[PDB]
Amino acid sequence: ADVEKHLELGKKLLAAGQLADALSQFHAAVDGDPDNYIAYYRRATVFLAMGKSKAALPDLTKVIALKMDFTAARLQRGHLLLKQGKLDEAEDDFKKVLKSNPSEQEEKEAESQLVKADEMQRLRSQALDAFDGADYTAAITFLDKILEVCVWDAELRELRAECFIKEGEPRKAISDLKAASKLKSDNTEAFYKISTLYYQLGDHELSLSEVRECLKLDQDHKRCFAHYKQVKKLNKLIESAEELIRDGRYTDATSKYESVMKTEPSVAEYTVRSKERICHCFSKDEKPVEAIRICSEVLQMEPDNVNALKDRAEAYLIEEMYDEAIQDYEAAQEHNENDQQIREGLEKAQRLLKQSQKR
């Protein structure tokens, strides 16, 4: 009777669009009578209207537990399961809807959802099959299709991410893993994986804070911890080096980047990036011979590295090799038409050249 009054009010409030207030009434009704099946149903239609399926599901399955013939609630759960990619359980729900005297509308909705589930069910086999056969591009194709419908399927999301890492597309993989993490709570393994991918990418900082998220969920995570110790060190070293170059302490910065390559010799990006900064160090410390040797090395690997070009240029000028200095500025300027810093140096190199040419 208090329950009934709460139920009635909630219906009015729901009809009027006052969702939170409707929710409150249906909560009160459920609390007033924990066995009443419609109370849980009413509350679930409110969560559904808000679009909070995480909250709706337990109430939907409660209703079904209490009232197995309650076709409307089972139809709704079937929808959520299909979206979650729980294909077997979805089909099971839709199929049982068909056999519990559905209204005409419910019958059409369930038949429509059984056609689609069966498509997904077929596509899932093709996706898993292509993956087991190490055909990662075929797999993505199928997963693309599946994930359009099964949008809250965390594991197929992660499987597509695996495809992307294998396909040499780590940034795409990070993105799928991030999306997946928003759908699942147990995220430790995904956070670990993204932190790793950042690491291999050279993004030491994001790698570090990403591994911190892992340790925040589980402090004892052995793999996450072992990697934390590695990035933490590798990251402090780079932070120290950049701090040293800020204060003009070039030989200590060189020394610092030397140990940066020591502590991570496998991942190419850390030597290449370290060499670039060392190239910068020798240049700014006005030590031209060494500057041109290693700025050249960097440039062997990265012919378009603007910083290396500018720094080698600056080193050529000490050596009074004006022709080589301008040629390096021109290469840098080629893709950086508007960069004021390149212009200044090129025009400087040209003034110095003229000076020497005066008679």
Swiss-Prot record:
The keyword Transcription does not apply. Induction: Up-regulated during an endoplasmic reticulum stress. It is found in: Endoplasmic reticulum. GO terms for biological process: cellular response to cold; endoplasmic reticulum unfolded protein response; negative regulation of apoptotic process; negative regulation of endoplasmic reticulum stress-induced eIF2 alpha phosphorylation; negative regulation of translation in response to endoplasmic reticulum stress; positive regulation of translation initiation in response to endoplasmic reticulum stress; proteolysis involved in protein catabolic process; response to endoplasmic reticulum stress. It comes from the Eukaryota. Changing residue 41 to H: Reduces binding affinity for misfolded proteins by 40%. Widely expressed, with high level in the liver. Disulfide bonds join 214-224, 279-295. One of its GO terms (cellular component) is cytoplasm. GO terms for molecular function: misfolded protein binding; protein kinase binding; protein kinase inhibitor activity; protein-folding chaperone binding. TPR repeats lie at residues 3-36, 38-70, 71-104, 120-153, 154-187, 188-221, 234-267, 272-305, 306-339. Keywords: Chaperone, Disulfide bond, Endoplasmic reticulum, Phosphoprotein, Repeat, Repressor, Signal, Stress response, TPR repeat, Translation regulation, Unfolded protein response. The modification Phosphoserine is found at residue 240. Residues 341-359 are annotated as: Flexible linker. Involved in the unfolded protein response (UPR) during endoplasmic reticulum (ER) stress. Acts as a negative regulator of the EIF2AK4/GCN2 kinase activity by preventing the phosphorylation of eIF-2-alpha at 'Ser-52' and hence attenuating general protein synthesis under ER stress, hypothermic and amino acid starving stress conditions. Co-chaperone of HSPA8/HSC70, it stimulates its ATPase activity. May inhibit both the autophosphorylation of EIF2AK2/PKR and the ability of EIF2AK2 to catalyze phosphorylation of the EIF2A. May inhibit EIF2AK3/PERK activity. The J domain mediates interaction with HSPA8. Interacts with EIF2AK4/GCN2; this interaction occurs under endoplasmic reticulum (ER) stress, hypothermic and amino acid starving stress conditions and inhibits EIF2AK4/GCN2 kinase activity. Interacts with EIF2AK3. Interacts with EIF2AK2. Forms a trimeric complex with DNAJB1 and HSPA8. Interacts with THAP12. This is DnaJ homolog subfamily C member 3. It comes from Mus musculus (Mouse). The gene is Dnajc3. The chain holds residues 35 to 393 of 504 of the full protein.
